[PDB]
Amino acid sequence: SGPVPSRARVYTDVNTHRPREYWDYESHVVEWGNQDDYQLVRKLGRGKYSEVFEAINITNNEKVVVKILKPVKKKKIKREIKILENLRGGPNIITLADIVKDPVSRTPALVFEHVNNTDFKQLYQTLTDYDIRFYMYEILKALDYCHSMGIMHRDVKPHNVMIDHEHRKLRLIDWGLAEFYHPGQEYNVRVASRYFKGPELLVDYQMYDYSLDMWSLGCMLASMIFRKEPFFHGHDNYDQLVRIAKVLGTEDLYDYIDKYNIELDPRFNDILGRHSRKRWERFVHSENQHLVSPEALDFLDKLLRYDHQSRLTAREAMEHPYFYTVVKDQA
């Protein structure tokens, strides 16, 4: 019969109502800058399909970040470019400053306005309680904006959040896996990093939506308030779901599978068994209790749900009492 179809609870038809040029990234005509404006200085890091360099813009002495794009599927270069251009100027979105080509290899490279090479993962084990709530709220601003623009990031994790802690500014980066949401579309489940994969990716449910990013955000939050990194620490994609079921319980896992008529891969059958839901208080101890409150546990509980439709949206999340102090102090 097939799996039951699903629709985003929010921003369902934003791309349908856009001019086709907005989301038809394969037809996008790239505006190329001048590679001679920039001099690479040193390598900052490496992705599986990218090389990242610190560089200087010699025309104005500004430091920038240069990302060399090299996906196997050429289609993904225009996808990342078109998403970055559609999102440019939105809150806490990294700003694409230029697009050039390596003069030797002719490989496309993105030029970003500089942010300090310090990600949320290097910082979030030394933050106070208030700073976790502040930066979580800033990430939610970025996610609600990109969701409202029809885009799911699909790779939300601490290494993709750059923070300038001195200036308390935050940028959500690496839009190389981001996609446009279209109702009824079946997407690739081989996205995101293992520890942050939502249950829909692990049980192979393809008609997912923005709510995938909200599961990943819940995984980051649990890691921070509990000082456990990663919070769900599987050895492969099958064990990853087992790690989740040992916390959220198996009853709601199978209710989820029943609801969408999902065919569970037989590799799961021998390793899941039965698990009761563990109350979130079971993870509190003396070295993390200063980060844990009733509002944090209630908020966490509403992000980490098997059923993607039951998870808080980014907008609903920003109204949670967990952020009441941040919202008051912000005005």
């Binding site: 001048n34 001679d36 404006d37 920039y38 001099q39 690479l40 560089a55 240069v66």
Partner: peptide, 5 residues
């Protein structure tokens, strides 16, 4: 490398 090297 854009500007030499």
């Amino acid at each position: 490398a854009x500007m030499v090297p």
